[PDB]
Coordinates of C-alpha atoms in Angstrom, one line a residue:
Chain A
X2 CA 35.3 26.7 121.7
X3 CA 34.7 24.1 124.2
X4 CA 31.1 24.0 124.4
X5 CA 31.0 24.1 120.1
X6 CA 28.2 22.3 118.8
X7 CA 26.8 21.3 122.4
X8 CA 23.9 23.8 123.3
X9 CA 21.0 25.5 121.7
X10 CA 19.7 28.5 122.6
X11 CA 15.3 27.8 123.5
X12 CA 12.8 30.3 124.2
X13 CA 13.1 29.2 127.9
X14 CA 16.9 28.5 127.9
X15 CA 18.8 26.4 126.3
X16 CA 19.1 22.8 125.4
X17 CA 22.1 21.1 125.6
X18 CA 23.2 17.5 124.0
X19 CA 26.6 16.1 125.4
X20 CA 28.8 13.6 123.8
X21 CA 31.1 10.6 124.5
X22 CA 33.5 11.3 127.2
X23 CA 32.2 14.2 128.4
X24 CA 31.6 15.3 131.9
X25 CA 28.2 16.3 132.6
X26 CA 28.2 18.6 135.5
X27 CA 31.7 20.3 134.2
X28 CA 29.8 21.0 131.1
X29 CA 26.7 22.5 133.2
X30 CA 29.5 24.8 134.9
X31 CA 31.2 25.5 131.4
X32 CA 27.5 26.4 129.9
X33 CA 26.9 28.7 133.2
X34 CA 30.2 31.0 132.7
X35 CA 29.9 31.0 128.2
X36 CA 26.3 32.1 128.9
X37 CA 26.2 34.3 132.0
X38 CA 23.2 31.9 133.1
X39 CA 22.0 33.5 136.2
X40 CA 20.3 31.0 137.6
X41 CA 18.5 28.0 136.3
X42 CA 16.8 24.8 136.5
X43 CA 17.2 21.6 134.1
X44 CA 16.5 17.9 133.4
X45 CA 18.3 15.1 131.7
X46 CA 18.6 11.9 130.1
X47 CA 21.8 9.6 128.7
X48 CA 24.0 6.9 128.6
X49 CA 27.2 7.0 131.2
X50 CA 30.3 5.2 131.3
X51 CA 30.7 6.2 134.6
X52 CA 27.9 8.0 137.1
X53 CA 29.4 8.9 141.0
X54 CA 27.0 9.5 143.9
X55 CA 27.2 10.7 147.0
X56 CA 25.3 10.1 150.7
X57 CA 26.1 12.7 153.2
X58 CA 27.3 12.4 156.8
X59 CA 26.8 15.1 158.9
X60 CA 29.4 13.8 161.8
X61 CA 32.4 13.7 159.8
X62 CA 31.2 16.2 157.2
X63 CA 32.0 14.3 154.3
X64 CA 30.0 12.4 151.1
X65 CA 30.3 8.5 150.9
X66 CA 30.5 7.9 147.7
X67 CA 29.3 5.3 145.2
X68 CA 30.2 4.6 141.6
X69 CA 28.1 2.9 138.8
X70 CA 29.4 2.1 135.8
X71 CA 28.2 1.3 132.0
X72 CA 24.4 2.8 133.1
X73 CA 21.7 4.6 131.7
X74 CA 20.6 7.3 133.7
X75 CA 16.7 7.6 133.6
X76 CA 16.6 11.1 134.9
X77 CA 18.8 13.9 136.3
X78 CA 17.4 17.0 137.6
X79 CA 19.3 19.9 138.7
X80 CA 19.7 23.4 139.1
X81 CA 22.3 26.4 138.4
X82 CA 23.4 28.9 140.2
X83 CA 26.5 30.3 141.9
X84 CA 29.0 29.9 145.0
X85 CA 31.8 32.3 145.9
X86 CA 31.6 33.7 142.1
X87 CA 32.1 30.0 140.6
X88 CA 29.2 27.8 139.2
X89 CA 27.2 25.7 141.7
X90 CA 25.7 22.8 140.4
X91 CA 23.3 21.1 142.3
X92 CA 21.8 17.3 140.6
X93 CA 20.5 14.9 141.4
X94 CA 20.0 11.6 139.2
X95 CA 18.4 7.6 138.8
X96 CA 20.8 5.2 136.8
X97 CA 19.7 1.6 135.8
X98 CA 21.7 -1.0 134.3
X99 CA 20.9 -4.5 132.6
X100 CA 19.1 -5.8 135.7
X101 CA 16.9 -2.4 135.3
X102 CA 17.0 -2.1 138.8
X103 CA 17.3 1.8 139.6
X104 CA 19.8 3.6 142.0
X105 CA 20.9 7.0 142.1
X106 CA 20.7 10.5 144.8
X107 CA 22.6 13.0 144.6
X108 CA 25.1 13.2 142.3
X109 CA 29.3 14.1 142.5
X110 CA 30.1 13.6 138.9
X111 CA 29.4 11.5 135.5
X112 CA 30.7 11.2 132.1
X113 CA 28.9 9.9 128.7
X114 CA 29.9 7.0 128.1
X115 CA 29.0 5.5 124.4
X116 CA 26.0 7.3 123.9
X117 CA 24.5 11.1 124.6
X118 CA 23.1 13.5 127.3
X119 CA 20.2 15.1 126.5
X120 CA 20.2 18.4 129.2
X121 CA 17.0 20.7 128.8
X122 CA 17.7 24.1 130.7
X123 CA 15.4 26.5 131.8
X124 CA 17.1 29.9 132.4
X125 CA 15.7 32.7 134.7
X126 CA 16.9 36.5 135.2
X127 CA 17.6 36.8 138.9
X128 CA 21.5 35.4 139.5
X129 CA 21.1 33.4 142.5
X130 CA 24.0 32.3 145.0
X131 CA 24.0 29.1 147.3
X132 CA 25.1 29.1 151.1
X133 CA 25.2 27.2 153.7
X134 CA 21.9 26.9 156.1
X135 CA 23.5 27.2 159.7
X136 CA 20.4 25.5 161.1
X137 CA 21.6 22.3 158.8
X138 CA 25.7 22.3 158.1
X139 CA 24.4 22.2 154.6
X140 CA 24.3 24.3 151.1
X141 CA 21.1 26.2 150.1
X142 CA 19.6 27.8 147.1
X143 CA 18.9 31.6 148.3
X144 CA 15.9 33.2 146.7
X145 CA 15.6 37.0 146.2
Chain B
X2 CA -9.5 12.6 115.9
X3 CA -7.3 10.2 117.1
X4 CA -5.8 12.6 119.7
X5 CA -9.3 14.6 120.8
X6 CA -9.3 16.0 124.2
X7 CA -6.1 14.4 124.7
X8 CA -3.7 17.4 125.2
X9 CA -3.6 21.3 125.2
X10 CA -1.7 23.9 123.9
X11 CA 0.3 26.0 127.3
X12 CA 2.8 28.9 126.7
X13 CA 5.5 26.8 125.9
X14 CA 4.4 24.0 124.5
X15 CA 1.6 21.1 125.7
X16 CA 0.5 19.4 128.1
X17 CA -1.4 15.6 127.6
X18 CA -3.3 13.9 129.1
X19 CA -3.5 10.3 128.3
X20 CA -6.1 7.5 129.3
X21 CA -6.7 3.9 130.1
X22 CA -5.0 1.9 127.2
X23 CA -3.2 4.4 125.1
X24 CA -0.1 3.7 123.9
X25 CA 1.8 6.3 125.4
X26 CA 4.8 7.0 123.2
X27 CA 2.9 6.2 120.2
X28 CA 0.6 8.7 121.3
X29 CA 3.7 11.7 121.4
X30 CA 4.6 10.3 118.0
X31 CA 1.1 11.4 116.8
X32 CA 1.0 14.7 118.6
X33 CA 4.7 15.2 116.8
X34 CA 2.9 14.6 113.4
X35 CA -0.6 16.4 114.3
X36 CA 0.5 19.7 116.0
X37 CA 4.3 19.3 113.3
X38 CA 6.3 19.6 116.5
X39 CA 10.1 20.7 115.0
X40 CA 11.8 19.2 118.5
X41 CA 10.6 19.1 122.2
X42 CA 11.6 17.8 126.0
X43 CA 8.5 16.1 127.7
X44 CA 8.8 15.0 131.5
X45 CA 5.6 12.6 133.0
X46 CA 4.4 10.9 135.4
X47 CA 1.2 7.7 135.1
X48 CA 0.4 4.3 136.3
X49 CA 1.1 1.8 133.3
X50 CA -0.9 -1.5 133.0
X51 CA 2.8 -2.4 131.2
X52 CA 6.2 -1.0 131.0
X53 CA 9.2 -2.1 128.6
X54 CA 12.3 -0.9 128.4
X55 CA 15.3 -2.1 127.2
X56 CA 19.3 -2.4 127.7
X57 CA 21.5 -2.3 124.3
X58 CA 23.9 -4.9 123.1
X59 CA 26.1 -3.1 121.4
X60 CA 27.8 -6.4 120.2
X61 CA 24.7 -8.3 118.8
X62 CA 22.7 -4.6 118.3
X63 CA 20.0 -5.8 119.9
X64 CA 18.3 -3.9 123.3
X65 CA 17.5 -6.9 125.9
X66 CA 14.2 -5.9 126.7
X67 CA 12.3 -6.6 130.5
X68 CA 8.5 -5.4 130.9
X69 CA 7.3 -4.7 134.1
X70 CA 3.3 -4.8 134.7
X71 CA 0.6 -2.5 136.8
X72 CA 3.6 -0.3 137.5
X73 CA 3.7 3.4 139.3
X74 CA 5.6 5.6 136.5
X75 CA 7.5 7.8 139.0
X76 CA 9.0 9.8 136.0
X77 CA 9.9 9.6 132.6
X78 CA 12.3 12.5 130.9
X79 CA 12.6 12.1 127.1
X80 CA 12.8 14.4 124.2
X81 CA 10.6 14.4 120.4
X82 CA 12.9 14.6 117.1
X83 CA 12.5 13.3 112.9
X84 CA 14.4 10.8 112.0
X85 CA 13.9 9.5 108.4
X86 CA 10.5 12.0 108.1
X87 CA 9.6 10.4 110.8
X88 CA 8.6 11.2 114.5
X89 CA 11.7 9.9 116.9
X90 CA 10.7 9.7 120.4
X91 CA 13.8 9.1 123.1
X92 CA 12.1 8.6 126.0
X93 CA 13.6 7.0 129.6
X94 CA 11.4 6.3 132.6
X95 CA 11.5 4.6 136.5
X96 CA 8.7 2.3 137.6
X97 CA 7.6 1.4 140.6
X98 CA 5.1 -1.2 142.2
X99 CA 3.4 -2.6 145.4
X100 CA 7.0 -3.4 146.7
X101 CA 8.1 0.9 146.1
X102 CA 11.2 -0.5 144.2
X103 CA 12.3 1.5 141.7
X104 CA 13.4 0.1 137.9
X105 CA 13.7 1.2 134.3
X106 CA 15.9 2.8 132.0
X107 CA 15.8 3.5 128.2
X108 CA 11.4 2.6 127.3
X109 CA 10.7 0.7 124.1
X110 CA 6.8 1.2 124.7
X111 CA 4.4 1.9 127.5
X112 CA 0.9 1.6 127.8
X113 CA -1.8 3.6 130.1
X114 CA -3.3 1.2 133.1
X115 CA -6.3 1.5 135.2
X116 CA -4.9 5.3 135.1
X117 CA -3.5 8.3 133.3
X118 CA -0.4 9.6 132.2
X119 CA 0.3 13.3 132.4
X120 CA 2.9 14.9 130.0
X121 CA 4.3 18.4 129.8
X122 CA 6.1 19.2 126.6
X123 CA 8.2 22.1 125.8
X124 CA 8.3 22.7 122.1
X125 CA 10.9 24.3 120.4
X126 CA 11.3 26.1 116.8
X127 CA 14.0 24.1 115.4
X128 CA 13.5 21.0 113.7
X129 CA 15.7 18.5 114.7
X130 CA 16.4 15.1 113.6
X131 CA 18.6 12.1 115.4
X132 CA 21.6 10.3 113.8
X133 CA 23.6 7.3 114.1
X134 CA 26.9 8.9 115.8
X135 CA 29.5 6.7 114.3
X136 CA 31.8 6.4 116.5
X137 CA 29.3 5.1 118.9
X138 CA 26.8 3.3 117.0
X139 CA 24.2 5.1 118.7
X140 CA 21.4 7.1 117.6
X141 CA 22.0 10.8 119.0
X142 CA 20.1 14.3 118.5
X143 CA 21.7 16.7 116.3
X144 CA 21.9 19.8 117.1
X145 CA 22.2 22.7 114.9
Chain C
X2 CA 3.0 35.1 155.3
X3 CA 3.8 31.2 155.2
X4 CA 5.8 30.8 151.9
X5 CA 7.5 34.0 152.7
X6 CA 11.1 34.0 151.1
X7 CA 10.3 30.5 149.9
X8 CA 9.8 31.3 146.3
X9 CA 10.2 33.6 143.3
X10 CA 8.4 34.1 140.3
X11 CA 10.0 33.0 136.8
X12 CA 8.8 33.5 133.3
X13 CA 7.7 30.5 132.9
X14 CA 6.1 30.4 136.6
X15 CA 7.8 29.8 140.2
X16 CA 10.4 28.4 141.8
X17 CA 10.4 26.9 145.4
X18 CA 13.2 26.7 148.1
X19 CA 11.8 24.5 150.9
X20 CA 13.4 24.2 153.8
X21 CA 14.1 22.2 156.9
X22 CA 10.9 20.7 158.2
X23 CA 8.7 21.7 155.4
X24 CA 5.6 19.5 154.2
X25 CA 6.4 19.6 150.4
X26 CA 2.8 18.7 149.1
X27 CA 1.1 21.2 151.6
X28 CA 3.2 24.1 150.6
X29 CA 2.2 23.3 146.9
X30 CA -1.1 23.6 148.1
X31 CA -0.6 27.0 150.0
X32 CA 1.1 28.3 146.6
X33 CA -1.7 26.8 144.6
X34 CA -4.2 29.2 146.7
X35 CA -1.5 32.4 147.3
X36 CA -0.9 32.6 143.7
X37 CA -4.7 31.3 142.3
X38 CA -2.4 29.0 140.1
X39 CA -5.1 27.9 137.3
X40 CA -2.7 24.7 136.7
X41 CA 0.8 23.8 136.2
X42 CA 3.3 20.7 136.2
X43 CA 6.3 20.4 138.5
X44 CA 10.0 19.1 139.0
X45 CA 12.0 18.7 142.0
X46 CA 14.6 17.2 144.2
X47 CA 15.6 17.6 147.7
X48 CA 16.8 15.6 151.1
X49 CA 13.6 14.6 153.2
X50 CA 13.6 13.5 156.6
X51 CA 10.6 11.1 156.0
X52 CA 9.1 10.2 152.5
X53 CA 5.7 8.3 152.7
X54 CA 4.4 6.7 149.0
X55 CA 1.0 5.2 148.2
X56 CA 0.2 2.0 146.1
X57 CA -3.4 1.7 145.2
X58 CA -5.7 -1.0 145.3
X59 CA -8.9 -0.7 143.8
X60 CA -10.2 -3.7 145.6
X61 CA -10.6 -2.4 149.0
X62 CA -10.0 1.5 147.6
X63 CA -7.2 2.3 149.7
X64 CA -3.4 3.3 149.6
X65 CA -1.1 0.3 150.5
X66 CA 1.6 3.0 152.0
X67 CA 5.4 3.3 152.8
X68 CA 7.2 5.5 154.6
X69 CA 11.6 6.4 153.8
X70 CA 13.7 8.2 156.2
X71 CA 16.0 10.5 156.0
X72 CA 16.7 10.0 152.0
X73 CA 17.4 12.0 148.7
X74 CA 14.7 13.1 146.5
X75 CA 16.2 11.8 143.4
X76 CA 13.7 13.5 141.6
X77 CA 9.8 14.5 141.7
X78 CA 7.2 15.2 138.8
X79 CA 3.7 16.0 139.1
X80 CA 0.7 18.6 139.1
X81 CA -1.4 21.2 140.6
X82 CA -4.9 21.4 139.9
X83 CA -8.2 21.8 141.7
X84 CA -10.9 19.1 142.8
X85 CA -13.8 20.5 145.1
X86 CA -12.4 23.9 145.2
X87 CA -9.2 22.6 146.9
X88 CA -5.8 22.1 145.3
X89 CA -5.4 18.6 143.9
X90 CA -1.4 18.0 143.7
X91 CA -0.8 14.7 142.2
X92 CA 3.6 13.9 142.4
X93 CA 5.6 10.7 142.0
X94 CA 8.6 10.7 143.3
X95 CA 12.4 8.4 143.7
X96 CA 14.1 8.4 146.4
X97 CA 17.6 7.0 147.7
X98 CA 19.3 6.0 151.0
X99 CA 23.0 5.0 152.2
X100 CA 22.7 2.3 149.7
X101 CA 21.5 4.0 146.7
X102 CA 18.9 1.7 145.7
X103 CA 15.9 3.2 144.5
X104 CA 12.4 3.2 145.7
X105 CA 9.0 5.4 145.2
X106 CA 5.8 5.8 143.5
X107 CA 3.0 7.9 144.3
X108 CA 3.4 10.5 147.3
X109 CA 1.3 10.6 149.7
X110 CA 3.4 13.2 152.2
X111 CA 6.9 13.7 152.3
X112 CA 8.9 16.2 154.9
X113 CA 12.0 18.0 154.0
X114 CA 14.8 16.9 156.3
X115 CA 18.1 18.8 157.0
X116 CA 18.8 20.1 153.6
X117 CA 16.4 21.5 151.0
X118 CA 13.6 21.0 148.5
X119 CA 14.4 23.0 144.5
X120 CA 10.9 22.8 143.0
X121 CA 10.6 24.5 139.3
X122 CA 6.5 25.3 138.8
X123 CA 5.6 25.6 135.1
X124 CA 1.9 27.8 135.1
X125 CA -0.8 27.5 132.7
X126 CA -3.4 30.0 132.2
X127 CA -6.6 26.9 132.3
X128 CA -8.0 25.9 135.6
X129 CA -8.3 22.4 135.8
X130 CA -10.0 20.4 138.0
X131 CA -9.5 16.5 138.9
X132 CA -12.3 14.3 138.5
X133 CA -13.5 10.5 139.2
X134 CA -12.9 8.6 135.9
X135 CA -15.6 6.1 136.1
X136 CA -13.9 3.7 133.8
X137 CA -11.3 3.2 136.0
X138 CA -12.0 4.4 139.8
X139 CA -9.3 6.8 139.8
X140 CA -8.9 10.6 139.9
X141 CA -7.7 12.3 136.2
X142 CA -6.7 15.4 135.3
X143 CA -9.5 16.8 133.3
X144 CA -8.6 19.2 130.0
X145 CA -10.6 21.7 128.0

């Protein structure tokens, strides 16, 4: 029942529209398992009360992170698929705040703040698993 | 005629095309109303002769607005819904100019520079309208 | 053989798994001409090793350019269509450093770096071609 009232099902997927206080990507994850998804790609829009980021560093294998708070997020875009028979989520977003001056990459976590997320998701057939690219000490999205 | 040669109908929805001067979410409003769109996602991309968006207040209910002019639109993510019989476009967008510095946020209008704007909208069958969420104060799009 | 294993069709058209070293625009163009894509819009998001953007002036009718190293795709939006017989991709992109300020515009080039580029391809069944609007000295997407 967690996901009541949250999604739409679309021709090409689904559309989702998140509320106050709750976590973006763990809702992503949550729609993933409730609908099988086997893969998929999406956009976004909202409001955040908190949005987390992360740069990578290769040499001590680790995301620095950065936290923005009170933001609209101009865009996310993302896709679904699987790691080790959990959901994967891979986003990416832009937040802005009263200065309207934009920041944003890759993204570790976010919650609505007072306001909504707005997810469109397009849903395809082949279930797809990440893994990591030896040539790169990073995670991948394998195709068929 | 207002919206000749402007757009075209795709598998799953439109795509637009938008010129030098037009009004750009003006111009969704009237596709909304001419092609009696029930909801839709759009993503696009331009050059704007003007930008404004805007950062709510939720204290005095007022956005603080900030226009930006002869602006890159790098992307703008939004979604078409009714709200009062009428078309309600939430629409965000990031802008960029001679110095690549990105901006934006939530857009309160936009209009078409010595440019374009291209727009690809997904339609879908249910017609949706927004709400005031009142434990927000915020307009958000209900879903079935 | 080029785009071997670097894509898979969808129902709504492709999606794209660049990898290390990869000219993103380029391999748009060799899918545009492997799979005699008539049109189609585009999202994305990646890690590039070098990002170059483009800011017109229509003065002395050449790109003011920038290039970004080693950044995150935030997000990228644009078209394929045709001009001359050649594919005509027109993207915008964001892109984000150590910082996670936010720059971009108009791409002009960008290489993926050591991670990945997700790139979801909605087809249309039109062929479109680009053309000189002469109103404005810029290239358009032409409809039916």
């Amino acid at each position: 029942q967690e996901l009541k009232g949250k999604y739409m099902k679309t021709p090409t997927g689904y559309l989702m529209v998140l509320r106050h206080g709750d976590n973006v990507l763990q809702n992503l994850e949550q729609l993933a398992r409730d609908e099988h998804i086997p893969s998929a790609s999406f956009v976004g829009i909202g409001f955040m009360s908190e949005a987390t980021f992360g740069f990578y560093d290769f040499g001590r294998k680790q995301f620095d992170p950065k936290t923005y708070r009170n933001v609209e997020m101009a865009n996310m875009t993302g896709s679904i698929a699987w790691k080790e028979g959990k959901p994967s989520i891979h986003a990416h977003g832009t937040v802005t705040d009263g200065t309207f001056q934009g920041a944003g990459g890759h993204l570790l976590g976010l919650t609505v703040g007072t306001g909504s997320c707005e997810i469109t998701v397009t849903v395809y057939p082949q279930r797809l698993d990440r893994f990591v690219d030896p040539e790169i000490q990073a995670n991948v999205l394998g195709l068929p």
